[PDB]
Every structure is written in structure tokens, then in C-alpha cells.
Write a protein that binds this ligand. Structure first.
Ligand SMILES: C[C@H](N)c1nc(C(=O)N2CCC[C@H]2C(=O)N[C@@H](Cc2c[nH]c3ccccc23)C(=O)O)co1
Ligand SMILES: C[C@H](N)c1nc(C(=O)N2CCC[C@H]2C(=O)N[C@@H](Cc2c[nH]c3ccccc23)C(=O)O)co1
Ligand SMILES: [Zn+2]
Ligand SMILES: [Zn+2]
Lengths: 106, 106
């Protein structure tokens, strides 16, 4: 499935913070589930797999120091929800940061 | 001379837009002198040498598509005047952009 770059959430039932927060249950993984819900993610129930209610993008293997919003932007730049909560400034900063990181190592 | 990263302009007499704009005279160079004055620069009177009234930083060899604020940030990141007119968001964007550029080529 391709990313929903529409202004309409792909998964309306997970549009409310609360709704998302509930899908987690006892969260044992490194990243805070509150942060995840705010960043728009709800849990799938297998490993640390989360999915954005709006663009539908998914992430896993959440490392210690890895940020929800940061990753959200990194992998689902077209997500409108992301755009609504952070604005393009933030988003570009993150994309420049990531690309520069990949370059520094290269 | 080192860059003035103080909140007090190094050259108070050039603190007013008008004051700066006047130092140019007939400007023949590529970059717009209005843009330059806004970015805080006043002309020295030799080639396209300009200097920030606040941090005192200087630039020359103004190329066709080269921006005052962009360059100001590139070479005088510590300038408080710069910080006051653009905010850190903008400034980081520019620094990430420049560094990533230097990396892409490398
Ligand atoms: C933040 C973390 N380090 C991180 N995760 C990811 C990440 O999952 N990505 C990057 C874009 C693609 C995705 C990924 O590989 N998923 C795999 C496996 C998978 C199948 N169903 C789901 C549902 C939810 C998450 C993953 C997943 C795929 O084939 O779709 C990048 O950084
Ligand atoms: C925007 C343009 N491409 C550009 N200019 C510059 C630029 O001048 N720099 C970068 C930081 C240092 C400065 C520079 O080299 N000046 C020379 C020559 C010089 C002597 N007196 C003055 C007064 C005003 C400007 C230059 C200058 C130096 O030794 O101080 C970078 O990009
Ligand atoms: Zn999303
Ligand atoms: Zn300055």
C-alpha cells in the first residue's frame, strides 16, 4: 500500500488520541507510547509495530534514542497529519538532518 | 577582527536601514542593494564588499544567485541581528543546507 498524502485520514477510527493510546496495552518497548500516540501512531499488537492513523505509514524496531515525530517525517514525509502538527520548517530540518547524516558517514 | 556575537551592534551608525542604503550609491553588482540593506549590510565602497552593521562580518564576490540572508547566516552564524530577523529555525535550515551541499559534492 502507498502512503496516504491526502488531507483525509486513512484510518478514521484511530483519529482520537485516546483511541490510539488504548491499542498499546502494556508497552515494554524503548519508545514511550504516549509520544507515539501524539505522533499519530497506534499499535498493531506484534512487536513494536505502529501505524499512523492518517497516512497509514508503519514503523518497527524502535531503537533507544529514535524519535516518533522524527521517524514519522523521515519515512512518511507526505503525511498531512505530520504537516499539520509540525509545519514544513520542522519537516525540512529533519530531512536535511537525516540526509546530512547519511552523507557524513559516506 | 573576530565576529561580534553580542546583542549590541558593533557599528551603531549603520543601525538604520536608510543609513545603510545610502552607503551604496549606484550599485552595479548582481545582488540587489535593498536586499543587502535589509539583511543588515552596508557598502564599503570597493567592489561589492559589504559589512554587517551588527556583527561586523564582511562578504564579497557576490554571485548572481547568492542570497544576503543565506550568506549572512553561512558566514556569521553568531550574529545576533541575524538571529533577531530570522530565528534559529531558518538559521539551522541554512546551515544544514550548506553542509549537505558540501557533502553531496564530496
Ligand atoms: C523507527 C524504526 N527504526 C524504523 N522503522 C522503520 C520501518 O518500519 N519501515 C520503513 C518504511 C517501511 C517500514 C518497514 O520496514 N516495514 C516492513 C515490515 C512491516 C510489515 N508491516 C508493518 C507494519 C508496521 C511497521 C512495519 C511493518 C515493510 O516491509 O513494510 C523504519 O525505521
Ligand atoms: C557572498 C560571497 N560569495 C562571499 N563572500 C564571502 C566573504 O567575503 N568572506 C567569508 C568570510 C571572510 C570573507 C572574506 O573572504 N573576506 C576577505 C577579504 C576582505 C577584506 N576586507 C573585507 C570586507 C568585506 C568583505 C570582504 C573583505 C578577508 O580576508 O576578510 C564569502 O562568501
Ligand atoms: Zn502519518
Ligand atoms: Zn551580522
Amino acid at each position: 500500500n502507498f502512503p496516504n498524502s491526502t488531507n483525509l485520514p486513512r484510518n478514521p477510527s484511530m483519529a482520537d488520541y485516546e483511541a490510539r493510546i488504548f491499542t498499546f496495552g502494556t508497552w515494554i518497548y524503548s519508545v514511550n507510547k504516549e509520544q507515539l500516540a501524539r505522533a499519530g501512531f497506534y499499535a498493531l499488537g506484534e512487536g513494536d509495530k505502529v501505524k499512523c492513523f492518517h497516512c497509514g505509514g508503519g514503523l518497527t524496531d524502535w531503537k533507544p534514542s529514535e524519535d516518533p515525530w522524527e521517524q514519522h517525517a523521515k519515512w512518511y514525509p507526505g503525511c498531512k497529519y505530520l504537516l499539520e502538527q509540525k509545519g514544513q520548517e520542522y519537516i525540512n530540518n529533519i530531512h536535511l538532518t537525516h540526509s546530512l547524516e547519511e552523507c557524513l558517514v559516506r
